[PDB]
Amino acid sequence: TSLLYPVTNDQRTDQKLDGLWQFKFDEAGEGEKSGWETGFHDGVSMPVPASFNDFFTDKASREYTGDFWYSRNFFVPSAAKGKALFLRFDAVTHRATIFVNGKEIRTHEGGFLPFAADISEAVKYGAENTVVVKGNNELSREALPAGDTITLRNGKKMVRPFFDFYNYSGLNRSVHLLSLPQERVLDYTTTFALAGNDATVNYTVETNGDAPVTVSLADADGQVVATAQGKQGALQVQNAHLWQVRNAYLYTLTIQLGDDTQTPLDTYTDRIGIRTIKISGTDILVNDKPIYLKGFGRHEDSPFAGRAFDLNVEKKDFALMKWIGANSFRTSHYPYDEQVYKIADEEGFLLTDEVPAVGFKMASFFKGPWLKKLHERHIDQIRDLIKRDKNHPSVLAWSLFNEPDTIDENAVPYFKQIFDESKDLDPQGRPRTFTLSEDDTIETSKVLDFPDFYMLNRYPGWYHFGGYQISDGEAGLRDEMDKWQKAGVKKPVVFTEFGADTEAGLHKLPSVMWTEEYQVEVLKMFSRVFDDYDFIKGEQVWNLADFQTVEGNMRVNGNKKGIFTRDRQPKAAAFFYHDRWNKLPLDYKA
């Protein structure tokens, strides 16, 4: 109903409820029958935001699957009586029921997009109030991301995902207490055109009343350069400062409700970048010039917060990605905290925004009774993502699956439907795509007509033709690249996963898989291939940093394909890209 990010001004308040909540596991499912929805203080303290998994010393807790409970007291100011009061949850992984003062307010499905609860009539204005969250982190084939939940021979419930990353759960992002006007901005949209040194922002504004609307754009020094009235309109910016890759310029948009006579009813402000995105045959055009993508390959994963957003790690990840010459990254495999995009906007990065449609395949999948509810939740999370991130200059494209099983002819109805129901959601109409796994190739894939450009996941030299065989793996990759070229490929091709697990410190001459030298050798190979084909317009290596993963005999304490360690220091492969990427211009191959 509204996913606008909270702001602070005279009409809107926003106060974080971050800190130490109370926490309890509910393996039995008795929490509500036990009166826990009224709040409790007999559990363990738990940080918010943060995944709860890594704070326990026992594996039974770290792996817990089922119903878990967060509880906190908070204060509702007297001054807030009469406004629309909201608890906004930035992410509750994966399922939530919200209670205030013991009263059930709302539920939510999906653990990586924000939701808000209207608590206007459930609080005592001027006193302490209680908020309790009943979360669940089970997996099934009916929810994103896809997986199964099993019971061990000893009764305990355990998750077995269809994806790589670990099942980090809980209150993974901030909780806001909001005060909004009764008549307020709900949504707005931006699209851009260029003409000479002039540009045109084309906006619209969604409201829940009939009061007049007034939009104004100011430059980075605060000077106003365009005004307009009405819920639709066009701002004319003379001699505009365009938003450029690794060279951002952000204008401030200000939406204001109310006619020239009354007290202002609502103010909303955001920062936009004036730039356009077109797929012209086989080029990716930003502001009508061709670009070349270089980057990662990312996860929201840190030692102490787990899946939860941590601003220190994020600014550090960004410091590194600029140092290394990169200009893009894909939010694999789920929407990130909204701060990630604002930094991307300020730093002129291009993001591929991915919905958690991962694990749609087994080691078939589109041939099961789970699709019907799965699809409900899939296209709903697509809608919420595009509604949340629409206005960011830095979002280049939407990714609607990661490694779905496109070999089966039954994937084709489902893709048909997903791609029709998302056709007209993004006002900028940016390209919609998805990643093709190693098994989904020009020869074998059945959904190659759908994407606006191709995103390829290939692992020669790691999952196939490892070691001394790498040369045959390079030859096979060029085989497939020859067949794309033969098939007269007209859309762009971007490599979005490739690489090699590497244990920082393992050295060998000559190399063996898992050493720092082999990783450089593998990345050099992929580079040689990428440079001999013109439809290839981007390299996004997997992965930026070592991230945590389910336990397995192939997981040396998590994934290790990262250019940097989980602590964000470089492996030797860091310096290879630092050399290569800072020498490829932004228009490489044009």
Amino acid identity of 327?
N
Helices (H), 422-553: 470-486, 516-530
Q: Specify whether the backbone of 465 is left (phi greater than 0), alpha (psi in -120 to 50) or beta.
A: left
Burial class (CB in 10 A: 0-12, 13-18, 19+), 249: middle
Residue 94 sits at the vertex; the CA angle it makes with 90 and 96, to the nearest 5 degrees, is 70
Nearer to a second copy, 62 or 383 (CB): 62
Nearer to a second copy, 369 or 552 (CB): 552
Q: How far apart are CA 186 and CA 3, in angstroms?
A: 8
Burial class (CB in 10 A: 0-12, 13-18, 19+), 205: buried
Query: Minimal distance in Å, beta carbon 24 to a second copy?
Result: 19
| SS3 call for 91 | coil
Query: Minimal distance in Å, beta carbon 126 to a second copy?
Result: 45
- Is residue 261 a contact partner of residue 215, using CB atoms and an 8 Å limit? no
Strand pairing report for 293-297 and 283-286: unpaired
Query: Minimal distance in Å, beta carbon 44 to a second copy?
Result: 16
Burial class (CB in 10 A: 0-12, 13-18, 19+), 195: exposed
Q: Specify whether the backbone of 64 is left (phi greater than 0), alpha (psi in -120 to 50) or beta.
A: beta
Running DSSP on this structure, what letter comes out for residue 569? P
Nearer to a second copy, 32 or 63 (CB): 63
- Going 554 to 556 to 557 to 558, the CA torsion angle's sign is negative
**In angstroms, how far is CA 92 from the centroid of its own chain?**
14
Nearer to a second copy, 376 or 472 (CB): 472
Query: Minimal distance in Å, beta carbon 207 to a second copy?
Result: 51
Query: Minimal distance in Å, beta carbon 465 to a second copy?
Result: 9
Between the alpha carbon of residue 510 and those of residues 265, 498, 507, the distances in Å are: 70, 22, 9
* CB neighbours of residue 180 within 10 Å: 24
- Is residue 359 a contact partner of residue 323, using CB atoms and an 8 Å limit? no
* CB neighbours of residue 420 within 10 Å: 10
| SS3 call for 372 | helix
Nearer to a second copy, 353 or 474 (CB): 474
Nearer to a second copy, 20 or 60 (CB): 60
Gaps after residue numbers in the chain (C–N over 2.5 angstroms):
363
Nearer to a second copy, 404 or 558 (CB): 558
| SS3 call for 326 | coil
Query: Minimal distance in Å, beta carbon 508 to a second copy?
Result: 6
Task: Report the side by side order of strands in the sheet with 232-237.
Answer: 185-195, 198-207, 232-237
Query: In degrees to the nearest 10, what's the CA dihedral of 64, 370, 88, 129?
Result: -60
Query: Minimal distance in Å, beta carbon 297 to a second copy?
Result: 18
Radius of gyration of the chain (CA): 24
- Known catalytic residues are 403, 497
Nearer to a second copy, 59 or 423 (CB): 59
Between the alpha carbon of residue 64 and those of residues 24, 163, 183, 533, the distances in Å are: 11, 18, 43, 48
Query: Minimal distance in Å, beta carbon 54 to a second copy?
Result: 10
Interacting residues with a second copy (CB under 8 A): 56-59, 62-63, 152-154, 158, 462-463, 466-469, 471-472, 475, 501, 503, 506, 508-515, 550-558
Q: Across the strands, what pairs with 95?
A: 109, 136
Nearer to a second copy, 170 or 499 (CB): 499
The per-residue b/e assignment along 14-48, b for 16 or more CB within 10 angstroms, e otherwise, is beebbeebbbbbbeeeebbeeebbebbeebeebbb
Query: Minimal distance in Å, beta carbon 511 to a second copy?
Result: 7
Query: Minimal distance in Å, beta carbon 157 to a second copy?
Result: 10
Distance from the first to the final alpha carbon of the chain: 43
Query: Minimal distance in Å, beta carbon 518 to a second copy?
Result: 8
Nearer to a second copy, 166 or 398 (CB): 166
Q: How far apart are CA 566 and CA 559, in angstroms?
A: 9
